[PDB]
Amino acid sequence: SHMSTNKITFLLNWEAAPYHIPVYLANIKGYFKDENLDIAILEPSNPSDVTELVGSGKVDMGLKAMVHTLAAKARGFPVTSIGSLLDEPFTGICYLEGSGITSDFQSLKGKRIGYVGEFGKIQVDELTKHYGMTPDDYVAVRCGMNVAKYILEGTIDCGIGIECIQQVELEEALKEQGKDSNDAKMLRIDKLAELGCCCFCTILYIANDKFIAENPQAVKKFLKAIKRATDYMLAHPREAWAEYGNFKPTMQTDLNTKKFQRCYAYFSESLYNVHRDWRKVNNYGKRLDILPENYVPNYTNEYLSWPEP
Amino acid sequence: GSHMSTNKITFLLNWEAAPYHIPVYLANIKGYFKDENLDIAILEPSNPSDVTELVGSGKVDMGLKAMVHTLAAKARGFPVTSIGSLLDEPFTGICYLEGSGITSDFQSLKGKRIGYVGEFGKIQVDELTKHYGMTPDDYVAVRCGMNVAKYILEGTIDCGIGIECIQQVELEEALKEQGKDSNDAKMLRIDKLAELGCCCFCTILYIANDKFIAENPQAVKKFLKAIKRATDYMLAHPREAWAEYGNFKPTMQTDLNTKKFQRCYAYFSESLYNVHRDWRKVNNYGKRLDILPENYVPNYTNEYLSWPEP
């Protein structure tokens, strides 16, 4: 046979990024150790791997956005959100002024539109019918984690991204070229779809259902440690950020520092799943035909051990 | 029921993404895994010391680790097997900068802060001391993870364990950044110090969980075929291959990483074969370090490789 391992696998939604600070900081400051937890932090090379891995139990826990978490279980990969990390970050179609793309959705006709994995394309395809268009009126291009990079390189004309990550990259890159950073703009997806929030892109703590049912204390203790790191980071951002970069030097760049400052306001303080946000995205998912008509949102706040705000 | 299964096979690197990982990524990028009907989920560790336990316990299917770690994993009850070789015998040693009081003499290490990655580097340095009129208390070992060269440059350690084509290139480039002579980046070779002859103890290997191997022999063979296909292309088209890799992983587009790749290039195993003699020497070394029991048998196999040993 084999020896047992207490290492709990935690798979990020993305390559290591500024908003992952509470996870790494919880490890770095020994908060996991203090809860007698050993967390193996893993980074995906492809974000589209993440929900199948967690859902199948090949990975115990991780992060993903809300729309992905919903779809994972509708697709037969039983994950559950046990908490929130990054709340409603502004999400949209990022573009550069002077490329012919304007605030009119119709300006996207015939454009190459980058998306990350799969769901971004589904979303844009659905939007088209709301603006006298069809999914053939543009070319969707799968870009993984390089949407902003490929916009800058000219290989796509615009692309789906988050304001505090992708738009910051564009802004900083414009500046470096001696261009106006305000040329970096975004058609908000929540505006286009008329939603009211970008809650569909709230980044959540998720876990496999069986892992939850079999390690209820580990889950609760994991969230205590995250909460402690989150409290610390929010009260001492500069010092926490420096701690994070000392461990992951990529975070020590000016570019990631700018991103972190933009991420800062979006961090969930309480880690709570916001009920109204889940209801609204659930309905959005059904509208997108990726969730069945009577689908129940897959989240819980029961492993959080402090008052709901 | 609604619970669906996955076809994804998890593959965990030994380290954050680095130039020598090109054959793994390239096999995916150029569609070689898909051509073999394999869906490989490439994962990157934040902590290299997590890897062998994750593969050994079966939590992760396959991955990479160096020989010493691979032998040690199964000796400790985490059953993995090397199924092929990625990076052959890369020069490994205690890296330092000229002028800091450290010299080719092991005894200059007295009272110094010596960085190591995870666990075994300290074991190795500790054992070395007694051959040089020293004890493990005659230096201060500092656990550094993947940031040994960084911390040498930042001065929070005096020297540390690293491989020539990664850590030493890092010191060389930073020295030029400072207007210094890059030749000031030196190492005390650990193979020389330990009387080994080769740095096969740091040969980086393709490894797999033993149960995964027994239950999926065809997937393993196919994985290695796709790896071999990527490896041939990369060795025959290094510039084009490197550019493909960097287009996917932008960090690989830096001048520093390009110089690391050029230095890694000579070390890539061309046939992926485990070298039997190397395993024998490293087995005995690990027994000597007391990390392997006296009757221990090397945990590797070449039987999933689909072309002859040249």
From Swiss-Prot, chain B:
The modification N6-(pyridoxal phosphate)lysine is found at residue 65. Its EC number is 2.-.-.-. Homodimer. The active site is at 69. Pathway: Cofactor biosynthesis; thiamine diphosphate biosynthesis. It catalyses: N(6)-(pyridoxal phosphate)-L-lysyl-[4-amino-5-hydroxymethyl-2-methylpyrimidine phosphate synthase] + L-histidyl-[4-amino-5-hydroxymethyl-2-methylpyrimidine phosphate synthase] + 2 Fe(3+) + 4 H2O = L-lysyl-[4-amino-5-hydroxymethyl-2-methylpyrimidine phosphate synthase] + (2S)-2-amino-5-hydroxy-4-oxopentanoyl-[4-amino-5-hydroxymethyl-2-methylpyrimidine phosphate synthase] + 4-amino-2-methyl-5-(phosphooxymethyl)pyrimidine + 3-oxopropanoate + 2 Fe(2+) + 2 H(+). Responsible for the formation of the pyrimidine heterocycle in the thiamine biosynthesis pathway. Catalyzes the formation of hydroxymethylpyrimidine phosphate (HMP-P) from histidine and pyridoxal phosphate (PLP). The protein uses PLP and the active site histidine to form HMP-P, generating an inactive enzyme. The enzyme can only undergo a single turnover, which suggests it is a suicide enzyme. A motif (CCCFC) lies at residues 198-202. InterPro entries: NMT1/THI5 (IPR027939), SsuA/THI5 (IPR015168). Keywords: Iron, Metal-binding, Pyridoxal phosphate, Thiamine biosynthesis, Transferase. GO terms for molecular function: 4-amino-5-hydroxymethyl-2-methylpyrimidine phosphate synthase activity from histidine and PLP; metal ion binding. Pyridoxal 5'-phosphate binds at residues 118-121. Its cofactor is Fe(3+). It comes from the Eukaryota. Belongs to the NMT1/THI5 family. GO terms for biological process: thiamine biosynthetic process; thiamine diphosphate biosynthetic process. This is 4-amino-5-hydroxymethyl-2-methylpyrimidine phosphate synthase. The keyword DNA damage does not apply. It holds the Pfam family NMT1. It is an enzyme of class 2 (transferase). The keyword Transferase applies. The lineage of its organism: Eukaryota, Fungi, Dikarya, Ascomycota, Saccharomycotina.
